[PDB]
Amino acid sequence: LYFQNIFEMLRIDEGLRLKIYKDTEGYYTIGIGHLLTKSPSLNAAKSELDKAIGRNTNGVITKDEAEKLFNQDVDAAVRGILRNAKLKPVYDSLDAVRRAALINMVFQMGETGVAGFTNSLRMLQQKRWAEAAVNLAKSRWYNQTPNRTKRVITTFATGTWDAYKNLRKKLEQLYNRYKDPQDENKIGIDGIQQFCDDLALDPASISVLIIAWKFRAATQCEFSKQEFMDGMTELGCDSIEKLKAQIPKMEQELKEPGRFKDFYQFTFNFAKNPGQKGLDLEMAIAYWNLVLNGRFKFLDLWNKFLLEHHKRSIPKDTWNLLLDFSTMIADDMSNYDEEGAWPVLIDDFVEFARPQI
Ligand SMILES: *C[C@H](CCN1CCOCC1)C(=O)NC[C@@H](NC(=O)[C@H](Cc1nc2ccc(C(C)C)cc2s1)NC(=O)CC)C1CCCCC1
């Protein structure tokens, strides 16, 4: 197999997941789009992953394990390309760099999706790079994934890695402005503050919490190099100005309840101290004032109730259920089912709040 840059090309274009996840079609995936099983059983998926890696992964792998799986998928894709009468001639005629761009296309839309580009594939086989580049840019493929497609088209146009190398340069230069002088592999307190100033935002603002959600950031006041790089590439941003222009779109998303729920639940995980399962009361109230502002009539009376009668950490389930509480609760609390399944804390809040109307 050893006799046969591509891993980094697809790490950028598709993304690398180190934890077992469900893909669009609902299948159990890991690494760079590696399918584990067609089975709806996570036990089966973990069994497949464990067998393939050779350890009890519990659904979590290293980047090197993800690479082992990725090289197997490249080999399978190449074999499939070679058994395809519409793809084999083009593939055989292409240099190593342009073959990687073709394998990239197969990874995205499959063999049938790629074979549909008959005129463009012909131009590539004929080494009419300029004509192929203009023709591939007319497709829906160019509008569905503009950033990825432009990179792939550039690879076919030049036969160089310049699209990927130049994106990494621009992001590394941008990163250097924010990295911690005491720790090059992370963005510190000062760096996060600088990042927020460049965006003309306060670090305690909702816009910055929305950005953290979009970057899938782990914890408040922490920002790793990997979070910065992966976040900027996935969002299709190579500058602060480009990130700034994405903010209205992120805002509109939150008008849809499913997205808002995902953001609201993410806030708890982001806000809490690593190593702690719960969220300290003072911090829970400060984040509730940000995310439930204009969504919960009883927000202040709730904060007052907790500061005076709870005075302890907020568990994740209670945090999640407060959103459902705020949505259904009548202004007079008459529809509250006290004989229901709400946390004891919410039952106690209703009991405390009801005499005060
Ligand atoms: C970490 C900081 C230390 C404690 N400080 C208070 C007194 O003791 C010493 C100093 C802290 O907990 N501050 C609370 C504050 N949080 C924030 O301002 C955060 C800061 C950010 N963290 C990140 C991480 C990553 C990113 C990237 C995705 C760009 C950005 C930011 S900003 N902001 C937020 O969490 C956004 C709302 C309070 C803010 C208001 C809500 C309560 C906590």
UniProtKB/Swiss-Prot annotation:
<dbReference type="GO" id="GO:2000436">
    <property type="term" value="P:positive regulation of protein neddylation"/>
</dbReference>
<feature type="site" description="Essential for interaction with UBE2M">
    <location>
        <position position="221"/>
    </location>
</feature>
<comment type="subunit">
    <text>Part of an E3 complex for neddylation composed of cullins, RBX1, UBE2M and CAND1. Interacts (via the DCUN1 domain) with the unneddylated cullins: interacts with CUL1, CUL2, CUL3, CUL4A, CUL4B and CUL5; these interactions promote the cullin neddylation and the identity of the cullin dictates the affinity of the interaction. Binds neddylated CUL1. Interacts (via the C-terminus 50 AA) directly with RBX1. Interacts (via DCUN1 domain) with the N-terminally acetylated form of UBE2M and UBE2F. Interacts preferentially with UBE2M-NEDD8 thioester (via N-terminus 1-26 AA) than with free UBE2M.</text>
</comment>
<dbReference type="GO" id="GO:2000434">
    <property type="term" value="P:regulation of protein neddylation"/>
</dbReference>
<feature type="domain" description="DCUN1">
    <location>
        <begin position="168"/>
        <end position="354"/>
    </location>
</feature>
<dbReference type="GO" id="GO:0031396">
    <property type="term" value="P:regulation of protein ubiquitination"/>
</dbReference>
<keyword id="KW-0007">Acetylation</keyword>
<dbReference type="GO" id="GO:0005634">
    <property type="term" value="C:nucleus"/>
</dbReference>
<dbReference type="GO" id="GO:0005654">
    <property type="term" value="C:nucleoplasm"/>
</dbReference>
<dbReference type="GO" id="GO:0005737">
    <property type="term" value="C:cytoplasm"/>
</dbReference>
<dbReference type="GO" id="GO:0005829">
    <property type="term" value="C:cytosol"/>
</dbReference>
<keyword id="KW-0656">Proto-oncogene</keyword>
<dbReference type="GO" id="GO:0045116">
    <property type="term" value="P:protein neddylation"/>
</dbReference>
<keyword id="KW-0963">Cytoplasm</keyword>
<dbReference type="GO" id="GO:0031624">
    <property type="term" value="F:ubiquitin conjugating enzyme binding"/>
</dbReference>
<comment type="function">
    <text>Part of an E3 ubiquitin ligase complex for neddylation. Promotes neddylation of cullin components of E3 cullin-RING ubiquitin ligase complexes. Acts by binding to cullin-RBX1 complexes in the cytoplasm and promoting their nuclear translocation, enhancing recruitment of E2-NEDD8 (UBE2M-NEDD8) thioester to the complex, and optimizing the orientation of proteins in the complex to allow efficient transfer of NEDD8 from the E2 to the cullin substrates. Involved in the release of inhibitory effets of CAND1 on cullin-RING ligase E3 complex assembly and activity.</text>
</comment>
<keyword id="KW-0832">Ubl conjugation</keyword>
<keyword id="KW-0539">Nucleus</keyword>
<dbReference type="GO" id="GO:0097602">
    <property type="term" value="F:cullin family protein binding"/>
</dbReference>
<dbReference type="GO" id="GO:0000151">
    <property type="term" value="C:ubiquitin ligase complex"/>
</dbReference>
<dbReference type="GO" id="GO:0032182">
    <property type="term" value="F:ubiquitin-like protein binding"/>
</dbReference>
<keyword id="KW-0833">Ubl conjugation pathway</keyword>
<protein>
    <recommendedName>
        <fullName>DCN1-like protein 1</fullName>
    </recommendedName>
</protein>
